[PDB]
Amino acid sequence: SHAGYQTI
Amino acid sequence: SHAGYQTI
Amino acid sequence: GNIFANLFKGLFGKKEMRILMVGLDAAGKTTILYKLKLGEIVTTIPTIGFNVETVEYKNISFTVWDVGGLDKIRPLWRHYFQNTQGLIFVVDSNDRERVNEAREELMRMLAEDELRDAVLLVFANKQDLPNAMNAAEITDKLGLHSLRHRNWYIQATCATSGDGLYEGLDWLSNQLRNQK
Amino acid sequence: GNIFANLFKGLFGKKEMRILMVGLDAAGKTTILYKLKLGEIVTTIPTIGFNVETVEYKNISFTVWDVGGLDKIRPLWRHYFQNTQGLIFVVDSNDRERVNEAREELMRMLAEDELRDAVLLVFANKQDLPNAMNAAEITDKLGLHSLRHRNWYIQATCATSGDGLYEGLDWLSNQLRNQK
Amino acid sequence: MIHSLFLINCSGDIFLEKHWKSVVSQSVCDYFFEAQEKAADVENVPPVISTPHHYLISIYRDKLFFVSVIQTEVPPLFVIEFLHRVADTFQDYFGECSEAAIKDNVVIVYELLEEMLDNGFPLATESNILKELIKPPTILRSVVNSITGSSNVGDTLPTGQLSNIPWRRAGVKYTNNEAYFDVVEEIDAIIDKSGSTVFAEIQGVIDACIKLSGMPDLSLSFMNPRLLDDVSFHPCIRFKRWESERVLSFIPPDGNFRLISYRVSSQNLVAIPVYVKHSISFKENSSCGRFDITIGPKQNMGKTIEGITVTVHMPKVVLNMNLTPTQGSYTFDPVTKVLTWDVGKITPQKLPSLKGLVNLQSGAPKPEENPSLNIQFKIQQLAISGLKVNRLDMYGEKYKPFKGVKYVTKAGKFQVRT
Amino acid sequence: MIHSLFLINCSGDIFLEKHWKSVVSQSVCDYFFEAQEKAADVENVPPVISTPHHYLISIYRDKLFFVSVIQTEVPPLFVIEFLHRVADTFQDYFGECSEAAIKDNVVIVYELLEEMLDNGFPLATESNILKELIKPPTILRSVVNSITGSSNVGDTLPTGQLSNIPWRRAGVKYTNNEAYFDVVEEIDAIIDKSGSTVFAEIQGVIDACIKLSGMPDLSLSFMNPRLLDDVSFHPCIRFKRWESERVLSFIPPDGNFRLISYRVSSQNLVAIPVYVKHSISFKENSSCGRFDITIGPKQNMGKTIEGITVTVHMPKVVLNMNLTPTQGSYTFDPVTKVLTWDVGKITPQKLPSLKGLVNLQSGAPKPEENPSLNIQFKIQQLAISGLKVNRLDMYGEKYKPFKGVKYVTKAGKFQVRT
Amino acid sequence: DLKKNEDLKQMLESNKDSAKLDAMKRIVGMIAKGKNASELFPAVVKNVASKNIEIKKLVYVYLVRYAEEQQDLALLSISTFQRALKDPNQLIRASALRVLSSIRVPIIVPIMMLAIKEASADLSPYVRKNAAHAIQKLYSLDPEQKEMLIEVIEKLLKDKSTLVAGSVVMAFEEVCPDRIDLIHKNYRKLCNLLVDVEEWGQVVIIHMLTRYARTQFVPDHRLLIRNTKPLLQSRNAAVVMAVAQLYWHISPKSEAGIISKSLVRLLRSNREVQYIVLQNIATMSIQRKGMFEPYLKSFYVRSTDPTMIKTLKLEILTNLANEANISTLLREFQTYVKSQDKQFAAATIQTLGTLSHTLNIKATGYLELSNWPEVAPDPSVRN
Amino acid sequence: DLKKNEDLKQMLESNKDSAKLDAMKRIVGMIAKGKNASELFPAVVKNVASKNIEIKKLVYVYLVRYAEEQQDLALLSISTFQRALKDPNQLIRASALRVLSSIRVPIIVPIMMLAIKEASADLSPYVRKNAAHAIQKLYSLDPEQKEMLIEVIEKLLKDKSTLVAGSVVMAFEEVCPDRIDLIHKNYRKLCNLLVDVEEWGQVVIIHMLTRYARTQFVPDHRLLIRNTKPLLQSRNAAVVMAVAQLYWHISPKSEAGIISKSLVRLLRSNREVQYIVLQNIATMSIQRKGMFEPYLKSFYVRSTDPTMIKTLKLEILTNLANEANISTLLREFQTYVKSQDKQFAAATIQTLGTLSHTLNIKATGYLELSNWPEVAPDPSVRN
Ligand SMILES: Nc1nc2c(ncn2[C@@H]2O[C@H](COP(=O)(O)OP(=O)(O)OP(=O)(O)O)[C@@H](O)[C@H]2O)c(=O)[nH]1
Ligand SMILES: Nc1nc2c(ncn2[C@@H]2O[C@H](COP(=O)(O)OP(=O)(O)OP(=O)(O)O)[C@@H](O)[C@H]2O)c(=O)[nH]1
Ligand SMILES: [Mg+2]
Ligand SMILES: [Mg+2]
Secondary structure, three states, rough: OOOOOOOO | OOOOEOOO | HHHHHHHHHHHOOOOEEEEEEEOOOOOOOHHHHHHHHHHOEEEOOOOOOOOEEEEOOOOEEEEEEEHHHHOOOHHHHHOOOOOOOEEEEEEEOOOOHHHHHHHHHHHHHHOHHHHOOOEEEEEEEEEOOOOOOHHHHHHHHHHHHHHOOOOEEEEEEEOOEEOOOHHHHHHHHHHHOOOO | OOOOHHHHHHHOOEEEEEEEOOOOOOOOHHHHHHHHHOOOOOOOOOOEEEEEEEEEEEEEEEEEEEEEEOOOOOHHHHHHHHHHHOOEEEOOOHHHHHHHHHHHHHHHOOOOOHHHOOOEEEEEEEOOOOOOHHHHHHHHHHOHHHHOOEEEEEEOOOOOEEHHHHHHHHHHHHOOOOOO | OOEEEEEEEEOOOEEEEEEEEOOOOOHHHHHHHHHHHHHHHHHHHHEEEEOOOOOEEEEEOOEEEEEEEEOHHHHOOHHHHHHHHHHHHHHHHOOOOOOHHHHHHHHHHHHHHHEEOOEEEEEEHHHHHHHHEEEEOOOOHHHHHHOOOOOEOOOOOHHHHHOOOOOOOOOOOOOOOOEEEEEEEEEEEEOOOOOEEEEEEEEEEEEEEEOOOOOOOOEEOOOOHEEEEEEEOOOOEEHHHHHHOOOOOOOOOOOOEEEEEEEEEEOOOOOOEEEEEEEEOOOOOEEEEEEEEEEEEOOOOOOEEEEEEEEEEEEEEEEEEEEEOOOOOOEOOHHHHHHHEEEEEEOOOOOOOEEEEEEEEOOOOOOOOOOOOEEEEEEEOOHHHOOOOEOEEEEEEEOOOOEEEEEEEEEEEEEEOO | OOEEEEEEEOOEEEEEEEEEOOOOHHHHHHHHHHHOOOOOOHHHHOOOOOOOOOOOEEEEEEEEEEEEEEEEOOOOOHHHHHHHHHHHHHHHOOOOOOOHHHHHHHHHHHHHHHHHHOOOEEOOOOOHHHHHHHHOOOOHHHHHHHHHHHOOOOOOHHHHHHHHOOOOOOOOOOOOOOOEEEEEEEEEEEEOOOEEEEEEEEEEEEEEEEEEEOOEEEEEOOOOOEEEEEEOOOOOHHHHHHHHHEEEEEEEOEEEEEEEEEEEEOOOOOOOEEEEEEEOOOOOOOOOEEEEEEEEEEOOOOOEEEEEEEEEOOOOOOOEEEEOOOOOEEEEOOOOOOOOOOEEEEEOEEEEEEEEEEEEEEOOOOOOOOOOOOEEEEOOOOOOOOOOOEEEEOOOOOOOOEEEEEEEEEEEHHHHHH | OOOHHHHHHHHHHHHHHHHHHHHHHHHHHHHOOOEEEEHHHHHHHHHHOOOHHHHHHEEEEEHHHOOOOHHHHHHHOOOHHHHHOOOOOOHHHHHHHHHHHHHOOOHHHHHHHHHHHHHHHHOOHHHHHHHHHHHHHHHHHHHHHHHHHHHHHHHHOOOOOHHHHHHHHHHHHHOOOOHHHHHHHHHHHHHHHOOOHHHHHHHHHHHHHHHHHHHHHHHHHHHHHHHHHHHHHOOOHHHHHHHHHHHHHHHHHHHHHHHHHHHHOOOOOOOHHHHHHHHHHHHHHOOOHHOHHHHHHHOOOHHHHOOHHHHHHHHHHHHHOOOHHHHHHHHHHHHHOOOHHHHHHHHHHOOOOOOOHOOOOOOOOOOOOOOOOOOOOOHOOOO | HHHHHHHHHHHOOOOHHHHHHHHHHHHHHHHOOOOOOOEEEEEEEHHHHHHHHHHHHHHHHHHHHOOOOOOHHOOOOHHHHHHEEEEEEEEHHHHHHHHHOOOOOOHHHHHHHHHHHHOOOOOOOHHHHHHHHHHHHHHHOOHHHHHHHHHHHHHHHHHOOHHHHHHHHHHHHHOOOOOOOOOHHHHHHHHHHHHOHHHHHHHHHHHHHHHHHHHHHHHHHHHHHHHHHHHOOOOOHHHHHHHHHHHHHOHHHHHHHHHHHHHHOOOOOHHHHHHHHHHHHHHHOOHHHOOOOOHHHHHHOOOOOOHHHHHHHHHHHHHHHHOOHHHHHHHHHHHHHHHOOHHHHHHHOOOOOOOOHHHHOOOOOOOOOOHHHHHOHHHHHHO
C-alpha cells in the first residue's frame, strides 16, 4: 500500500 | 453373599 | 441427537420449571425471589411490570416470574398462564383485611383452564410478625382444602429469615419431579 | 508449566488485585461492595468483622475486603496491610464532623510502611444528598494533594445510583495494569 | 456434660485430644495414670475416677482407653453409652477402631467428634444420619476428592433427620434388593469340675443387614414365641404389635445393625454341646505334674462343633509343659501361664485332646485349686435353643428381595473348673 | 426534529422505513411521488417539499431518495447534512450505500438508525464512536458470532466519547504504524468554443488514512502556504496554530477521513492540461452532419494524462453516428443522445480523436447551438496548483511510521462548448 | 401467515437464546418493512427482561414502535427499566433512560418525571446529555409538566461540560423558547464553550444566540462575534450557514463581506446544499450585491445543472448583472437561450438561513426576529 | 518450625483453595496433637469468610478452639456468622448458630442474645433444637442473662416436636433446675412424647420427671408409670437404668419387682456397664433382696472377672446369701478363696442411678430428692 507514496 | 442363608 | 448427550445433561443437571408468582401488593413476592436468587435481601420498590429470574436448586432451573399485583397491572397475570408448571401464590399472613381478596384472586387463578395442570404452592409469608396467622388459619381463610382435583400445598414462610422457601421448592421438586 | 498456558489464562482473563476497603462508620462501604458484586443494593446492618468479596471487571478479579470501621474493631485494619495492591478509602461527603477523623485514619493508613506500594482511591460517597461536598472540597478537607510519593486519586461517588464506582475501578485498572 | 475427650495409648501416652467447652489441661490425666498405676490390670481400671477437679469416666476397649472429662453430675451410663457409641462409630468409618486407623484419618476423626457432641450434649447420633453428614472415606472417594476437592460434608440436612423415622436414610436406592437376618445364639456357661453344669443360659441376638430401597416394612414371625422372654427391641420396632401379636413389624434402618437382643426362657434347659474331660494334678514342691484333657460332643445337636479355642489359665508353679494335642495346634505361654489350644473342630469319630506332663517349679508350693478353662466354640446352621424364624413378610415395596436367614450358635464365656 | 425516514426506490417504491417520534403514515409519500412526477428528472427534485402536514426534506444520491419527515421548523442544512451523513455511514458499514446492501443487512441498518438519531435529534455521530457502539459486519466476525452469539454491540461507552478528543478511538493499537496523506486537486473548468478558458479554478482536498496507535499528534507543513486561501479544517485541527503559524497540528481520528478542504488562490492562474479541438456541424432538415474532435495535452505539466472519459450530450436530431476513435472505445447512446468515449490516456506522441459523420434526422430542424462536452481526466504524481507538502512531524508516540504522501490531480466538471 | 406468527411466539417462549434472537431479527425486519407485528406484542414483551444484551436491544426497538398501540401491555413491562436505570454502568443507564422515556403511556408519566430528576443529578455527563433529550420527550408527551421541566433545564444549563451543554440548549430551544432570562445567566460561558461544542450543537446554539442577541443588543456583542469567526472554516455546511446567518443579522455592516467567500465555497458541495445555499445567496444579494459580484463566474450555469439550479444561478446572475459585466452575461444568456432546456431558456429571456425563507412560507414554530431595541436591556445580566 | 509456620500462612494467604485446604488440615491435625497454633490465628481467621464449605468447616474448628486466647481477633470475625445466620438453608443456619454461640467473647454477648431470640422463632425444628443448646452455652457464658433465657426456654417448652423437646428439657435441667412451674404446663404432653423422643433425650427427661414426681405426688402418677413401662426393653442401657431409677423412687412397692429382670440382662454387656449396674444392684438389694435372689447364679464370679467386678458380685452374693442357699454359696466361696487372687480371696473370707452414689460422694450439682409431701400440690396444674 505504501507504493506510490513519497516519503515525508 | 446369599450362600449359607435359608429362604424365608 | 445422541440420547446419551441428553441423559448426560440431565445427570449433569438439566431440569426446568415455569413458575408464575402472583399475589397481592406487599405480599413479599419480590423479596422472596431475590432472596432465593442472590441470598441477600435487596432494597425494593413497588413492582409495575415483572421480574423474571431463574434459581437453580436440586438440579432444577426454577424460572420464576415476579408479576406485580397492583390493580392497575393485575389483569396482566393472564399473559403468563400459558404453559406453566406451577403457581406460587404468596399471602401476607398479617393482612387480614385482604385475605379474602387474595382468596378471590387465587380462586380466579384456579378457575383458569390453562392452569389446571399447575401445582399450587401457597406461602403464608411474614411469620415473624406478632399478628401473623399460622398455616392452618391461613388454609382455613383461603379454603385451600376445599379445592378439588388439584395438587396443592401450603407452606408457612418468613422471607426475612428465608424460612419455608427451600421447603417450598422441595415440595415443588417432589411434585414436579415425576422422575429424576 | 507451559508459558502459553499462563498466557492463555491471562488472555481468557486472569488478573487479580488485593484491595483493602477501610473508612468510617456509615461511610457506605458495605453497600458499595455488594452493589458492585450483585448489582442490587442489599439490606445491611453495622459490620463487626469483614466481608470479603471478589468482583470481576475488565478481566481483573478485584478482591475487596469490607473491613468495618467501628472503634471497637477499627485497629483490625492492620491485619490486612500485608501484600495489598490498592487501598480504597470511602468517605461520607455529608459527615462534616468526622471528615478530619477520616483524614487522620487515612493518614495513619498512609503512614504504614507495608502500604507504601498501594494506590489510594478515595470515594466521596453520598453525592445524592443536598449537603454533600464535592470532590474538590473533599480533597481539600482531606488534604489528599499534600500527599507525596504516592499514587492517588479522588472519585466522586453515589452508591445509591452506582455512580463513580466503575470509574473508580477504571482508574485502578489503569494504575494496577502496568501492562495488559 | 462432657467437657473433653482424651485418647490414651495403653503405653501411657496422650494419643489424641478433643475439647468442647474449654481447654482442659493435659495434666488432668495424671490422675488417670495414677489409677492405672494402682490398677491390677488394664481391665481392672475403675470406670469412674474422682479427681480434685473434674470426674473422669472411661472405657477400656481395643487396647485403648477412652477417657472423658466431666464437670458436673451426669448419669454415668449416659456418658458411658455415648462414649462407647463413639468408639463403635470409629469402627464403622474406618473399619477398625485403633490408633493406627485414627493416625491416618485424624482430620475425619476430629470432625466426627465435632458432629457427634455439641458442647457436651449429643447432637449427631445414629449412623444413618451421621453417614450423610460426613461421607466415609474410601479409595474411590478419595480419587473423586483429588479431582473435585476433598468434599465429604453434605450441604443439606438428611431428610430423615426431620422425619418421623430418623433411623432410616431417605431416598435409599438399590437394584439388588435384599435383606439378611443372622440369628446368633450365645451359650454362656459355668461347668463344674465333675462335668455337671453349674449355670448355663442362652442369650441371643438377631443382626440384620438391610439393602432394601425406599420405605419397606419388615415383619418377623417366630417358630416358638414362648422362648422369647426378656427381649430388647431396636427403637425402630413398634413394640405395640410385639406386645399384642408378638410380631416384629418395623421400618428398618439400612446397613448393619442389631435388631433383637434377647434372653431365652429359663423354663427350658440349656443344651451344652461340649463336655470337658480333664485330669490334672500338681504336687507340693514337685518338678512335674500331669495334664490330660478331652474335648467332645455332649449335646452337640447332631452337628459338627467348630471354631474351637481352648484357653487354660495356669498357676505360677508351671514352668513349661510336655503336652501333645490330637487336634489343631497347642502353645504354652510361660509369661502369663496360659495354655492356648487351637482345636478348630470336633470330629464325630475323633476327639481333640491334650495328653502329657507338666513341668513344675521344684520347691514351689502346690496350687490351692486346679486352673480353670475357657472355651470358645460354635455350630453352623444351629439355633440350639430351638428358636427359629417362622416368616418374614415385607410391605410397602414392590420388591421380591432376598429373604435370607441364618442360624449360628456361638459360645459366650464357657468356663469349666479343674 | 426528524420524525421519520423513508427510503424510496427510484422505481417508485417505499423500500424501507424508520420512525422515531410516531408512526408516520406511508401515505405522506404521495406528495413526494407527486413532486417526482412533476420533476423534470431525478436530479431536479426540490430538496424541500411542503405538504398539507409535515415538510419533506430529501437527498438524492446513489439512485436512491432519502426522504425525511419534519414536523416543525428546522434549518434545512441541519437536516440535509445529517441525512447525508447517514448515507455516508451506510457506505462505511456495508462498503456500498445501496438498497441491495441494506436488504442483506436490514437489521444492522435499522440499529444504526436507532443509534444515530435520538427522538429527532442526533446522538451517535462520528464514525470513531459509532464503530465502537456497533461493530461492522465482516465474514470473520459473523463466524465468531455463529459461535459466541450475534454480538456486535458494545457493553460500555467508548472512552473517547467522554474525552476531550471524541473524534478518536481510545486504546488504538497497531504494530504496523503508518499514515497516508492523499493530496487531491480538483480542476473545475468552463472552456469556450474557441478553446479559451472561460472560468477555471482549482479546489482540493487532503484525505488521510491513519493507522497510528495511542495518541499521536500529526503536523503538516506546506511548500507554498500562500496557495491556501479558503480552507476548511476538520474539527480535530487546532486552527489557532494554523492561524498564527499556518501549521496543521492535530490529533488524528483513525481510519479514512477528509482532513483539509481548500480553494487555491485566484492570484495564480489555473493550468489546463487538456485542450479540445472540436469541429462539429448540423444542417436544417439534413440526414447528415459532421464530427471531429481531438483531445490533447495543453498545459499537461510534462505528465501523462490518464483516466479520461469524454461525454457529449447531443441534440435530439441525432439518430446515429459514424464516428471512429483513435484511442480506447466509443459508443453512442440514442436513448439519451450521448457520446461516450473512453479515452484512457493521452500519449505525448499520439492524440485521442473521434473522426467521422453524424446520422441526423431528415426533416428535423438544426440545433440552436452545438452540444457541450464534459471530460473526466487525471494525472498521477501531479499537484497541478504547485501545492506540495513540506514536512510531516509526528509527536507523542515512539514510532517511526510510514509517512507517505501522494499527489494526484483529478478533473472536476470540465465543460467545453461546441 | 398465522402459522409463522405461532412459530415466532414459540421462539419467543423458548428458553433458547438463539431461537429468541432469530425471532427478534425476523420481527425487526418486519418492522422495517412496515408489517403489522402488533399481534406479537404480548409475547415479545416478555423478553424485555432478558439478560441477553443483543436481544434486549432488539426488544427495545419493537417495544417502542408498538408502545402506542398496546398501552396496557407497555405498562406491564416498565419495572425492568426502572430497575435498570440504577445499574452502575453509564451506557446501560443512558439506554435505559432512552427506552423508558420513549414509552408513550400517560400512566407512567409521573414515573418518568422522577426519573428525569434523577437523571439530571447523575454524576456522569453522558447520562446528563440523555436527560436533556428525555426532557424534550416528556414535554411533548405531557405539556402540563412544563414548569417542572423548566426547573430541571435551568439546572442543566449550569453544567460546564460541552457534552451536555449542546443538547441542553436544544431542549431549551424547543421546550422553552421564551424565558431568555435563563440564557443570559450562561451567556459568556456558552460564548466560549461554543468552539468546543460538537457541530450539531453548534448549529443549534448559534441560531439561539443569534435571536438572543437581536433582543439584547442595540464588549459582549463583540465577544459573540469574535468567538464565532473561526467557525467559518467548518467542514459542516450547516455550521457555516449558521455562522453566516449570525453575521448577517448581527455583524456590523462593514464586516459583513467576510462571509461571502465561504458561501461561495459551499457551492462546491452536493446538489441539495447547492440548492439551499443558492437560495440564501439570492436572498442576501438583494441587499448586498457587492458581496457576490467578485465571484460572478462561479454562478455560471452549466449543462449538468438541474433546471431548478439553473434557475437559481440565473436569479443570482440577474442581481449581479450591471453595465460593467452585461457584455459578457448577455452572451452567456444567449447560449442559455440556445440550450434545449426551453423552460430555462424562457426564464433566461426574462433575465435568512432557516426553513421559512427557503419555503418563503412561515414554517411551523417560526420564531420572529426582533428589531434592535431603542434602549438596550440592563447590562448587569451580561447583556 | 517457624519456616513451616510461614508456609502455612502463605497457603492461608494464597488464593488457591487446595493450598488453603492443606493448610487447614495440617492445622487441625496440630490441634488434635495439642500443639500451640495460636500464632496462626490472625491469618487463619481471614478464611472464615471463605465460600469453600469444607474449608470453612475446618476454620470453625480452629476458631473455636482458640477463641478464648485471641478474643480481640475473634471479635474481628463475627459478621460472617451473623450474616450466615439468615441464610435460607437449615443446615447452614444451625451450624452458624453453633459456631457463633461457641465464641467465648464477652463483647459479643448481646449479639448472641438477639440471635437466640431469632433462633427460637425459627420455623424449622432443626434450628430450634440447636437454639436450645445455644441457650445452655450462653447461660454458662453469662449467668446474668438468665431471666431472658428462661423466657426463651418457656417458649421452647411449648413446642410439639420431639426433635426439639428433648434438647429443651436438657437445657432447662441445667439452666433452670428450679421453677418446676415451667414443667407442669407440659406434663401430660411430655408424658406421651417421651416414647417417641430420641434415647438421649429420654434419659434426661426421665431423670427430670422422676424428681418432678417426687414433689408432686404423695391418674397422673399412673400416667407417668404406664407410659414409661415399655422403655424397659430399650437397647440403651442408660435408658434402662433411668427407667429402673424412676420406678425405684416412684413406683408402688408392689410393682417394683418388674425391673430386676432387665437389670440382670444389663449384666451381659461390657465391663463398664457391668461395673455401674452391679453397683446399682448392690445398692438396691439392701432394701429389696427378693428382687435379685431368683437370679442368684447370675452373680457368680468367674476367672475372667476383674478384681473390682469380682468384688461387686461378691458384695451382691453377700446380700443374697441365706440358709436356703448358703450350702452352695460357701462352696463357691471356698473356690474363690482357693483362687490365686488373694485380694479377692481375703474379701471372700469376709463375705439410685446417678453419679453421686456411684462415687458415694455428693457430686457437683447433685440434686436432692424430696420426701413425699404430706399434702399434694393443687391438681389443677396437672399435678
Ligand atoms: N415483616 C416482613 N416483611 C416482609 C416479609 N417479606 C417481605 N416483606 C416486606 O414487605 C414489603 C413488600 O415486599 P415486596 O417483595 O416488594 O412485595 P411484592 O409482593 O413484590 O409487591 P408487588 O411488587 O406490589 O407485587 C417490603 O417492605 C418487604 O421488605 C416478611 O417475611 N416479613
Ligand atoms: N444517602 C446515601 N446513603 C448511602 C450511600 N451509600 C451508603 N448509604 C447508606 O449509609 C448507611 C451505611 O452504609 P454501610 O454500607 O452499612 O456503611 P459501612 O461503611 O459498611 O459501615 P461499617 O460496616 O460500620 O464499616 C446505610 O444506611 C446505607 O444505605 C449513598 O451513596 N447515599
Ligand atoms: Mg414486587
Ligand atoms: Mg459495613
